[PDB]
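Form 12-C: Joint structure prediction
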Amino acid sequence: AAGQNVTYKDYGIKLEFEPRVDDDNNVSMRVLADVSDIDPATSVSL
Amino acid sequence: LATPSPFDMEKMVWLDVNILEIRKSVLENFGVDWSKQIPGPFAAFGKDFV
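Section 2 - Result
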């Protein structure tokens, strides 16, 4: 609501891995890969 | 007594996407621009009879 509460946002290199493996060593997986940097151009002063 | 596989090997699909865009524009502004509303004539009369 409203128009306080401070949270935190992560930037950098982030990686998440969730593997599953078969009897023939086949790998079924979900992977999240993120590379994120701060940009001066689109920052707002408030 | 049979058991299932942990998962099933699925087929893998490759997607290739193309987006193409072209924009063109022309802008011209030429000539002489004059006034269109100008003051006109005036007349006034005034007298004191008494």
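Section 3 - Comments
Residues 16 and 32 of chain A are 5 Å apart (CA to CA). The beta strands of chain A are 12-21, 27-36.
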